[PDB]
Antibody, heavy 220, light 214 residues
Framework: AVHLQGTELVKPGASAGVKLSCKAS????????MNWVRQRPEQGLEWIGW???????TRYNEKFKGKATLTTDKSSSTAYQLNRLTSEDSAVYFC?????????????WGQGTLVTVSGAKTTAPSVYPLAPAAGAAGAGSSVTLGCLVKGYFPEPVTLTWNSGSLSSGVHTFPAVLADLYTLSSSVTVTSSTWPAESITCNVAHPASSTKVDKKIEPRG | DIVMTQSHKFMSTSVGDRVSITCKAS??????LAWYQQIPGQSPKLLIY???NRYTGVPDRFTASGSGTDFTFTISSVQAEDLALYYC?????????FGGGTKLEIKRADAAPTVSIFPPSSEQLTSGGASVVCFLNNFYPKDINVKWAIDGAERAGGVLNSFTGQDSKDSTYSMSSTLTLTKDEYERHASYTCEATHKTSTAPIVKSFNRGAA
């Protein structure tokens, strides 16, 4: 039962560094070298470097020169990832180990640790109702309403329609950065049912303890 | 640095069918190559070690071949849970490098996007903000081009796009495109258009509105 337990996600400021953790278990920690891999949405997976707990120290990837100076510690079988500068280092970092003795392929991986670099502070989201121009209800047999959530930090926010009773025809999209995470959701129902049968989006933001239930109404 | 190239970011397949992902190492990495699979929000899973060896527990449907500069991952008969990302990785000489990955997706009937455009809400305008939102939902193939036009001229500054992966139920894709201006600039223009170019129609799908005009 080989297992690698990584650390919870952290939100460092665009300036300092953060030491990540990886608790190996189920095998003699010193018998295998630990590896670290980075994964960003646009650049894919990139190997960072390895470490020998038996002590052969390290060997880093050219690209992660001094921005990543690994370290470890026996008597606890945990490996650490320093992360120096940090600013464009926002991504998920993995802890990896190989399986057999003669293949550098990574058979064992940690669950990964998300790292977000931002100077923003906890901020409640503004929620904006999206209704078809001039109220009405479209021009077909179906009408689409929406909810725009922006200016919040940090992730995440939960969004439902009519307290969850409206789940079909819903499209809720991944939030995108921009100082204050912004996301949106659309709901599509039968034209004759709105505004006859009310529709409200419920947005909740754990970090700020805030909730907003914005009803969607015809507008001019 | 050796460069692993996976020429296909996405590959259309079907359940019960055969599919082959290809990988091309910039150099002869001999047989030092591995294949990984990854599902959203999870870590990579080793599927193949040393070019063509199944790791333990990896089902017979998964196969890999090649040795030299060209390698190929194959799935005899695709199953629902195989519609994920597969990564190539050479471990011949450091630094270890991974391919860009290939996402397998379910092929289905072409479907035109339903496009909806929304003017800024009064509540946002009071805060000095003006976001125009455009939804493009339930379309297939994923290939789509969204353009914004303000008073006719195309606008690229201030556009933020978001999309969902292929739906696990209806195999379509959806997308949101938001044009965010300040109320100051928003009120200095009159015509706002969201234009979707998709293979399902010769003419791009267009949705618009005029400030203050119903």
């Amino acid at each position: 039962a080989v297992h690698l337990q990584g650390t919870e996600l952290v939100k460092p400021g665009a300036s300092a560094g953060v030491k990540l953790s990886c608790k190996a278990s189920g095998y003699t920690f010193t018998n295998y070298d630990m590896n670290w891999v980075r994964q960003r949405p646009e650049q894919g997976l990139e190997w960072i470097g390895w470490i020998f707990p038996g002590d052969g120290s390290t060997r880093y990837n050219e690209k992660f020169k001094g921005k990543a100076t690994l370290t470890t510690d026996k008597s606890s079988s945990t490996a650490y990832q320093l992360n120096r500068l940090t600013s464009e280092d926002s991504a998920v970092y993995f802890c990896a180990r190989r399986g057999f003795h003669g293949s550098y392929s990574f058979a064992y991986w940690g669950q990964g640790t998300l790292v977000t670099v931002s100077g923003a502070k906890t901020t409640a989201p503004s929620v904006y109702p999206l209704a078809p121009a001039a109220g009405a209800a479209g021009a077909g047999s179906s009408v689409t309403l929406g909810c725009l959530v922006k200016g919040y930090f940090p992730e995440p926010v939960t969004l439902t329609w009519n307290s969850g009773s409206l789940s079909s025809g819903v499209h809720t999209f991944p939030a995108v950065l921009a100082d204050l995470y912004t996301l949106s959701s659309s709901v599509t129902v039968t034209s004759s049912t709105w505004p006859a049968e009310s529709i409200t989006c419920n947005v909740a933001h754990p970090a700020s303890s805030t909730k907003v239930d914005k009803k969607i109404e015809p507008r001019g | 640095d050796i460069v692993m190239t996976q020429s296909h970011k996405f590959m259309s397949t079907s359940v019960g069918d055969r599919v082959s992902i290809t990988c091309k190492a910039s150099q002869d990495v001999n047989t030092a190559l591995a294949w990984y699979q990854q599902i959203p929000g999870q870590s990579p899973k080793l599927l193949i070690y040393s070019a063509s060896n199944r790791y333990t527990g990896v089902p017979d449907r998964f196969t890999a071949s090649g040795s030299g500069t060209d390698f190929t991952f194959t799935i005899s008969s695709v199953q629902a849970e195989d519609l994920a990302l597969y990564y190539c990785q050479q471990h011949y000489t450091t630094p270890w490098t991974f391919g860009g990955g290939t996402k397998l997706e379910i092929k289905r009937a072409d479907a035109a996007p339903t496009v909806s455009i929304f003017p800024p809400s009064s509540e946002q305008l009071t805060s000095g903000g003006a976001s125009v939102v455009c939804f493009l939902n339930n379309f297939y193939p994923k290939d789509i081009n969204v353009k914004w036009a303000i008073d006719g001229a195309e606008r690229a500054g201030g556009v933020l796009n978001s999309f969902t992966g292929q739906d696990s139920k209806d195999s379509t894709y959806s997308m949101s495109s938001t044009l965010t201006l300040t109320k100051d600039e928003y009120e200095r223009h009159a015509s706002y258009t969201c234009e979707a170019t998709h293979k399902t129609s010769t003419a791009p799908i267009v949705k618009s509105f005029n400030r203050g005009a119903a």
